[PDB]
Amino acid sequence: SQSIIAYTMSLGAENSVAYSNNSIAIPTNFTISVTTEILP
Amino acid sequence: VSMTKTSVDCTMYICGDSTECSNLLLQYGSFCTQLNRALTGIAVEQDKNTQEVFAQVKQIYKTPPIKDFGGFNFSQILPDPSKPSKRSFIEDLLFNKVTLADAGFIKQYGDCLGDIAARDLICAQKFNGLTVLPPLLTDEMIAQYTSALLAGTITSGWTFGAGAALQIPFAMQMAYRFNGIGVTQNVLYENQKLIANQFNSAIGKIQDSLSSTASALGKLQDVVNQNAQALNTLVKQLSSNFGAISSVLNDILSRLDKVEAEVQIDRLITGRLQSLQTYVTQQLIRAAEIRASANLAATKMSECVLGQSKRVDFCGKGYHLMSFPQSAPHGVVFLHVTYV
Amino acid sequence: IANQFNSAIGKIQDSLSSTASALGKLQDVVNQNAQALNTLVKQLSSNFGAISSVLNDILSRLDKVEAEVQIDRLITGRLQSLQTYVTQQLIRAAEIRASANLAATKMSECVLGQSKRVDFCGKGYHLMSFPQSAPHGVVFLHVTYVPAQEKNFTTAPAICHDGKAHFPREGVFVSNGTHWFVTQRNFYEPQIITTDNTFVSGNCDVVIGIVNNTVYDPLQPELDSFKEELDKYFKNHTSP
Amino acid sequence: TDNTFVSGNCDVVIGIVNNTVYDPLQPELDSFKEELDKYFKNHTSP
Ligand SMILES: *[C@@H]1O[C@H](CO)[C@@H](O[C@@H]2O[C@H](CO)[C@@H](O[C@H]3O[C@H](CO)[C@@H](O)[C@H](O)[C@@H]3O)[C@H](O)[C@H]2NC(C)=O)[C@H](O)[C@H]1NC(C)=O
Ligand SMILES: *[C@@H]1O[C@H](CO)[C@@H](O[C@@H]2O[C@H](CO)[C@@H](O[C@H]3O[C@H](CO)[C@@H](O)[C@H](O)[C@@H]3O)[C@H](O)[C@H]2NC(C)=O)[C@H](O)[C@H]1NC(C)=O
Ligand SMILES: *[C@@H]1O[C@H](CO)[C@@H](O[C@@H]2O[C@H](CO)[C@@H](O[C@H]3O[C@H](CO)[C@@H](O)[C@H](O)[C@@H]3O)[C@H](O)[C@H]2NC(C)=O)[C@H](O)[C@H]1NC(C)=O
Ligand SMILES: *[C@@H]1O[C@H](CO)[C@@H](O)[C@H](O)[C@H]1NC(C)=O
Ligand SMILES: *[C@@H]1O[C@H](CO)[C@@H](O)[C@H](O)[C@H]1NC(C)=O
Ligand SMILES: *[C@@H]1O[C@H](CO)[C@@H](O)[C@H](O)[C@H]1NC(C)=O
Ligand SMILES: *[C@@H]1O[C@H](CO)[C@@H](O)[C@H](O)[C@H]1NC(C)=O
């Protein structure tokens, strides 16, 4: 039931930022993220 | 950020419509391939360069329907949905200044034969196995990534780079910026109508400049000119005799038997193959100049657009507040905003 | 923060144990250099128009007059094969140099320092990085603070208390919907709006969007309790 | 005293100059001295 599909690529998930002239979002907690980067 | 992807069929460039020549080119072996690998490595890298620069957000941010940015008028650098591609007013100016050649987007004999056979260099290129390939991201997809970077910047400041986009009022974002350059945030709010009018007036001069002076995109048109001059030099080199009785591969085979023709044809293979190695070397060397420029553009996207930069003169002359990316043909344009 | 770092390093071991393609940038360098040395060997098979690819099969068959015509074909094609290899290797050496100068810059700025450059040491705010060696490369483990659980607050650019506009020294003003606080601009820790949290500049007419609140003075109850000390000494001294 | 910080005596700094540094606590206690002293003046009367 597999086949080769062809499609227009998605650039990313679409998202409206909740902007207003008097509203701010502030983080109540954080994640410490460790990420690998590899260079020749 | 990128240059025209080219695939050259060296079997058709060298031995155009001859099996006799093709059977002689096999005596050089890997030469026909190693050139296709080199040009494929360059072509694959143009999509990489374009993703390293523009695909710096995995979410496509969009602007609110209400435009209360505290008096700052981004309407010349935000999208225009009235258009068949969602580019901004300043991006449509940038796309008019650079005149692309053969974007890869389909040929169908009626656009090359007859009338459009004669006044055409792209036709003379394609008929000799030289082909220009399309970029993976269209000029609409680059404008969507640019719209996401710009909508993230105005609605969310630096925070959309370091995590989820956190909203902040635009004059509250500009206060943080002012603190970043060592000017106290009260200097923004006590002058906010002046600072907005100065930004709106300074963006007016970007439109007027790009409408007025022809040479503004000289860095990008000179990339299109170099790649087109190279494809034209590679076509003109089919005219060289290299010491053969003719430049035309068929006029040899029209006149000589298999003993005499191999002496003339090996001259044309020798010179043609040297012409491709010269082209592919010069293109491998140019691809490194474009890579170095794309890695700079990716660094200015990260540090000027997704941030605020304490690096001196990295985002124009002055103290950096913020930057707005704009797409251009094979390039990126940054509108750097600076306190002077 | 320690448990999050220890858990995030656990995912580095698990990732490198689980997925095959993680070092694709370094294996692709080894693959390019091996493919080039193999192409340079296979090019010894090319005749270049000579009676054989094998240099000895010419000299096995031809005298010094005929052999020089065949041998100069093989010299011409072989020498062109090396100039192609050495050109492609000089061009690749500049790609590796450019990557090594980036790796030396990330060693200096991410490992020997802490970087204010955005997204130079992974996505998030840079804390520190740890270098790790790999075959023909370096691997950086970049440690980053990423803000995670945001809440929406109402906010203001300034406070009006005394005909005077107050701005945060460090931080931003936020409202829970009924009360106003200062907080730091990277982590929600609310504090009462005092004269220590804020600085004054100008009257309340010039700031667009300013709001009314009451700014606490840390010296005021410290002198008001000194007024109730003063006034009770006066009350007791009425009695004699 | 809120705009500035102190360090050392006035002999070591090349090019230093004389001025008067306002103390934001001083008139806030001097007006508390005139509050104190008027409570003393009124309490002379009974
Ligand atoms: C932000 O800047 C925008 C461009 O400067 C500006 O849009 C401009 O607004 C004026 C007035 O609405 C338009 O003027 C034209 O309006 C109609 C067009 O059919 C005609 O009847 C008029 O004679 C006149 O030509 C501009 O055309 C319009 N420009 C663009 C490119 O949209 C915004 O108003 C500014 N934003 C704010 C909040 O002021
Ligand atoms: C800092 O520089 C500002 C300009 O970069 C300046 O704003 C300018 O103020 C002048 C008046 O001082 C305005 O001049 C116009 O004023 C009215 C019309 O509005 C006319 O009577 C005048 O003949 C003249 O046309 C400028 O238009 C105005 N420019 C802007 C962009 O606002 C500030 O006042 C300066 N601030 C300080 C403290 O020096
Ligand atoms: C916004 O934040 C405010 C500050 O945290 C909060 O007000 C606080 O609410 C608690 C009760 O939930 C009060 O605690 C006192 O409550 C009574 C008062 O008589 C006493 O019996 C208790 O022992 C205790 O002292 C805080 O005093 C109060 N803070 C202030 C300055 O009023 C609001 O409720 C928050 N609003 C929202 C919508 O979340
Ligand atoms: C904020 O926007 C609202 C409309 O949504 C408007 O009524 C109000 O005056 C604005 N306030 C400021 C300070 O811009
Ligand atoms: C009031 O003053 C008397 C001295 O005359 C002292 O003994 C007494 O402890 C004082 N009481 C208070 C409450 O100050
Ligand atoms: C500054 O220069 C003047 C001469 O122009 C000199 O008399 C004076 O002592 C100098 N002051 C300091 C603090 O160097
Ligand atoms: C002085 O004290 C009396 C109480 O004996 C009070 O009625 C009056 O208002 C006070 N006046 C002043 C000026 O403190």
Author numbering:
A (entry chain A): 689 to 728
B (entry chain B): 729 to 1068
C (entry chain A): 923 to 1162
D (entry chain B): 1117 to 1162
Provide excerpts from the study.
Although the viral evolution is slowed by the RNA proofreading capability of its replication machinery, a variant with a single-residue substitution (D614G) in its spike (S) protein rapidly became the dominant strain throughout the world. The S protein is produced as a single-chain precursor and is subsequently processed by a furin-like protease into the receptor-binding fragment S1 and the fusion fragment S2 (7). After engagement of the receptor-binding domain (RBD) in S1 with the viral receptor angiotensin-converting enzyme 2 (ACE2) on the host cell surface, followed by a second proteolytic cleavage within S2 (S2 site), the S protein undergoes large conformational changes, which result in the dissociation of S1 and the irreversible refolding of S2 into a postfusion structure. We determined the cryoelectron microscopy (cryo-EM) structures of the full-length G614 S trimer using RELION.
The overall structure of the G614 S protein in the closed, three RBDdown prefusion conformation is very similar to that of our published D614 S trimer. In the three RBDdown structure, the four domains in each S1, including NTD, RBD, CTD1, and CTD2, wrap around the three-fold axis of the trimer, protecting the prefusion S2. The furin cleavage site is disordered, which makes it uncertain whether this structure represents the uncleaved or cleaved trimer, although the preparation contains primarily the cleaved forms. The D614G substitution eliminates a salt bridge between D614 in CTD2 of one subunit and K854 in the FPPR of the adjacent subunit, but the FPPR in the three RBDdown conformation of the G614 trimer remains structured. To examine the structural changes resulting from the D614G substitution, we superposed the structures of the G614 trimer onto the D614 trimer in the closed conformation, aligning them by the invariant S2. A shift by a clockwise, outward rotation of all three S1 subunits, relative to the D614 structure, is evident even for the G614 trimer in the closed conformation. Thus, the D614G substitution has led to a slightly more open conformation than that of the D614 trimer, even when all three RBDs are down. The closed D614 trimer thus has three ordered FPPRs and three disordered 630 loops, whereas the closed G614 trimer has three structured 630 loops along with three ordered FPPRs. In the G614 trimer, one side of the 630 loop packs along a long hydrophobic surface, largely solvent-exposed in the D614 trimer, formed by residues on the upward-facing surface of the CTD2 along with Pro295 from the NTD. An ordered 630 loop that stabilizes the CTD2 by closing off an exposed, hydrophobic surface may retard S1 shedding, thereby enhancing the stability of a cleaved S trimer.
